[PDB]
Amino acid sequence: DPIADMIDSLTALQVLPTAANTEASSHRLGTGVVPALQAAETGASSNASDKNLIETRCVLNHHSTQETAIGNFFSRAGLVSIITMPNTDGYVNWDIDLMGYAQLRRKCELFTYMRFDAEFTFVVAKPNGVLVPQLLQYMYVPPGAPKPTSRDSFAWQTATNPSVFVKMTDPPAQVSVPFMSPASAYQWFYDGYPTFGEHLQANDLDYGQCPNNMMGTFSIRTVGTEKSPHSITLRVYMRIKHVRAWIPRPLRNQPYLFKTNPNYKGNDIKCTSTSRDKITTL
Amino acid sequence: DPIADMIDSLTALQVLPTAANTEASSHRLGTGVVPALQAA
Amino acid sequence: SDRVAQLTIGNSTITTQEAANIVIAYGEWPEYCPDTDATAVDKPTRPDVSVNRFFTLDTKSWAKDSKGWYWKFPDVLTEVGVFGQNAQFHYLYRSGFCVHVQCNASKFHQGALLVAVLPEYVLGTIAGGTGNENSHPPYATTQPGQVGAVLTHPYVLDAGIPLSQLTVCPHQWINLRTNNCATIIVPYMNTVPFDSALNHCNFGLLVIPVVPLDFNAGATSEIPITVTIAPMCAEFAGLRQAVKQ
Amino acid sequence: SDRVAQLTIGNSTITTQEAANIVIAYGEWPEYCPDTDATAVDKPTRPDVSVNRFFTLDTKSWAKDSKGWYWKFPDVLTEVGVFGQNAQFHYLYRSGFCVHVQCNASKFHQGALLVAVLPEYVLGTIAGGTGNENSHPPYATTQPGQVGAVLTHPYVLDAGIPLSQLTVCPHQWINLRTNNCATIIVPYMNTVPFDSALNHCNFGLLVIPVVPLDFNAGATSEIPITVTIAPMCAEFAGLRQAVKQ
Amino acid sequence: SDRVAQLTIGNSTITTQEAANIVIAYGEWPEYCPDTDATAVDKPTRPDVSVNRFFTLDTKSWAKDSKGWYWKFPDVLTEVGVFGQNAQFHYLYRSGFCVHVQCNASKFHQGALLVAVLPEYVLGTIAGGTGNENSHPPYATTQPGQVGAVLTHPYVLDAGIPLSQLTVCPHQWINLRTNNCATIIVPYMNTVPFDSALNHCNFGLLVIPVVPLDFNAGATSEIPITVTIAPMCAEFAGLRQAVKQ
Numbered sequence A: 001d002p003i004a005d006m007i008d009s010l011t012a013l014q015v016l017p018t019a020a021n022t023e024a025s026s027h028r029l030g031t032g033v034v035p036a037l038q039a040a041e042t043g044a045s046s047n048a049s050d051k052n053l054i055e056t057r058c059v060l061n062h063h064s065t066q067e068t069a070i071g072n073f074f075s076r077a078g079l080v081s082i083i084t085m086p087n088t089d090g091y092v093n094w095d096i097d098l099m100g101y102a103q104l105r106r107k108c109e110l111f112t113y114m115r116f117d118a119e120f121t122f123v124v125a126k127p128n129g130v131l132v133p134q135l136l137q138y139m140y141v142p143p144g145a146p147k148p149t150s151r152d153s154f155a156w157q158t159a160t161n162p163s164v165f166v167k168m169t170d171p172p173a174q175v176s177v178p179f180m181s182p183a184s185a186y187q188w189f190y191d192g193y194p195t196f197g198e199h200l201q202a203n204d205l206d207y208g209q210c211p212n213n214m215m216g217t218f219s220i221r222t223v224g225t226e227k228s229p230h231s232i233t234l235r236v237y238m239r240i241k242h243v244r245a246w247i248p249r250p251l252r253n254q255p256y257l258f259k260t261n262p263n264y265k266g267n268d269i270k271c272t273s274t275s276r277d278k279i280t281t282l
Numbered sequence B: 001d002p003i004a005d006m007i008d009s010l011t012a013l014q015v016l017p018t019a020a021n022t023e024a025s026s027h028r029l030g031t032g033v034v035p036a037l038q039a040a
Numbered sequence C, D, E: 001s002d003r004v005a006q007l008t009i010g011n012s013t014i015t016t017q018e019a020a021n022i023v024i025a026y027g028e029w030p031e032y033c034p035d036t037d038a039t040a041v042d043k044p045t046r047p048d049v050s051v052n053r054f055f056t057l058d059t060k061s062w063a064k065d066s067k068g069w070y071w072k073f074p075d076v077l078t079e080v081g082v083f084g085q086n087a088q089f090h091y092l093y094r095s096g097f098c099v100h101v102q103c104n105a106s107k108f109h110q111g112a113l114l115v116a117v118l119p120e121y122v123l124g125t126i127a128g129g130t131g132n133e134n135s136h137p138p139y140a141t142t143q144p145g146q147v148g149a150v151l152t153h154p155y156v157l158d159a160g161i162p163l164s165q166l167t168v169c170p171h172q173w174i175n176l177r178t179n180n181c182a183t184i185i186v187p188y189m190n191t192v193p194f195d196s197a198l199n200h201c202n203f204g205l206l207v208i209p210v211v212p213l214d215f216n217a218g219a220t221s222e223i224p225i226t227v228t229i230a231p232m233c234a235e236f237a238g239l240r241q242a243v244k245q
């Protein structure tokens, strides 16, 4: 070859089912060996242990680390939607956005990226909680599919769209939903704009909107041609299964205002801690 | 044993009947080796 | 003697004599995209010297009541050099970064800066103050260019998340009694192997004074902060005419 | 890099970054009493953590005309902690000590302290001045407690013996340009294997400024001196009701 | 830890704690004259301790507008000690040298000296100013003794050759922020194996402030410069009565 310059991770995983044992230690007097003095400017956490700062005994502990695994942290059904049919013509088209309730939103926004399968449960009743014999139909409308315009629309023929027929006196319906993003994970934070072009002030709503998370429309109706005399209230619950998560984030200390942006009330900034009077008196 | 923490001088003498001898030495020029600087 | 360091890449060299370690973010070095992860079928271009080199931005001035600054990546370099021309002529880009922040002062000054990298730094507003307006940040705020922008509420990082747990991100400190520089090496982090350089920002760099600057009258009162950055494994694909934004 | 040191014993730790060596007095580490040297037949108690730990006394103030201070051992600890309770409930005691004296100042201060251990420090008086009175020192002078006392004539160490040959005893210096601490490890020294803790003092610790403290006006004028001590192999025997003195 | 050095020869010792390396001029250590290079047939004398030792000359004062100083070798030592007596009683002499220049200041001073050895330093004049006089330097100028002389035009080194390429000669710097001493070891350089000590000077030592001395008012304004020299392999031959010049 005539041209010689054209010839040309740090850590690994380990299974830790229990917490770490403590070894016995004695006193230590000498120079040069100082495990208590650190340097926080390097960006590294402190590596000082119990046995280097005090005299310890031997503790064989069997405290399990299973519950803090992120599969056990997330596999709990939380509320994502409340849909009402008082919307007086017997059908609702609901655009799927699961960031409307603060408890599951703060848990998921601990991470930046997440990839999971879901399990949706549909708890339906009257607005006062009473149940009546009434037939309903839930339909998932993917993006691009025709959405229903009335109670007797042609889109309720559901020849390819997945649909569930259920009664109100039945147990709540459960379905499994796969991972269906065009990307490799869902992102709760998208720093940018979806399309090209000029970014004027009238189009500032486009900032932060990722189309890889937009999953379509969830439609409900009462099945018959005629109007039902019953009011409907549907509550949707979501379990997160088979989960992978990347890049932990600071947890939010401000109350949520809108579903699509991290906007916060600027006149009342909440402090993260509870205040006291003096630094010396607790 | 069930309990693991219950398991658990500098100088010596020499005979010196006489005082110390002196060795012959020459000049010395270099860095790093400073026997004249002390720390009281 | 690990306080001295030298970073040489391309035709550029940074020397420092008062340093901490180098932080490698999430324990991963930047790499080119392998064949198993790629999806686009055209051959990408890798310029390898004209784009993988140190770039020095504008210089800030640390005052006694400074709030903090932020930059967006790779928005800082889309108009600079041969990197800024490859990012305009191509549709897709992929690269890691080596960030270096410089701030020196005397032995009679005091203060501490937190230099952190936060991926997908989405900004919020104060919602009109009362919380009733659905306001959105302007285009000069979300992508401020190589100049950068100032933080308005640094305690909530202008996004409703506290500064006190920003150290869960890859970070260093610049403590004026200890060191004068901070160095973080960042890999490529996205849900896609390639992305647009004009529409998407991967991470934000935050420089916030946690302990404020202090000195006695008669010492130097002009304490500047300089940011120097380098792409590492820059790839470009999808060649078409030049698009600025 | 032997200027840094860490002393950990019990539930206490001392760190220093500006140090000399550790002096081990007469080349001997403290030990428990062996069977060949013992005479008392009852089994002694060895608490081993609650008594073998670092104890911090009151703090002195180094002025520009200070004479010096002294403490008596183990009289400084007979009312402090679990060591002070074992010394009152038992008739016999035996232990070594680790003495640590702290004094820091800036790089624009100067001065030197001599920190020495003198066993059987018997004090004298000025004999009425003229030498005709057979005077004796009071009980607050011979056993001043954890507070300590001030030397009246430091040139003769209040005992008729010169300061200039106090360095024949185990000692260190605290030179303000060089180090900020001094550490001496003292074994048990007596003519008997056990003794009383309320009636007998084994050694005295002397801290005398040989070179006086000096600084310019505008620097910090409050330069304090702190003494931190630790028993090493404390044994107690002869259990009976509590006797304070 | 190569900043500390100790030079011991004879009954003299120099210690320094803030030093650069030692320069060995042209990579050659001083030696005695071998039998192949010698021409004179009489046996030479080698005193070996009374002449090979460190000699300290007079002390200069570095002001804020100093031009520079020079010394001539071995003219500085022809009246000093046992070396000055062997150089007067003998006709031929041969030796190398170890030159050491000392200048200390605080950490708030600044300045830089160039310490160079120039063999066969022949001096010129200003030729009457206009260039028409064939003037010659006086005897006190060409051989100033152990006191030395001041340079009048240091930019041309009083010989028509520029200061800027004096570093082609064996040299060191004394930069006040870095070191306080400079050490050059010079071998014997001549066209003859032996020569006269009263008629011929082998080399000249030049100490010139390239960066001038600067400090603020209130610091020490008396910054002195001391030269200490040592013959290395001194030989003498041709014994006759004492001749001073």
Ligand SMILES: CCCCCCCCCCCCC/C=C/[C@H](O)[C@H](N)CO
Pocket: A096, A097, A098, A099, A118, A120, A138, A139, A140, A162, A163, A164, A175, A177, A186, A187, A188, A213, A214, A215, A218
């Ligand atoms: C008959 C079956 C109906 C159930 C259909 C459910 C499909 C929708 C599953 C979506 C999984 C979560 C996708 C992202 C949700 C969040 O709204 C986005 N991150 C918005 O930020």
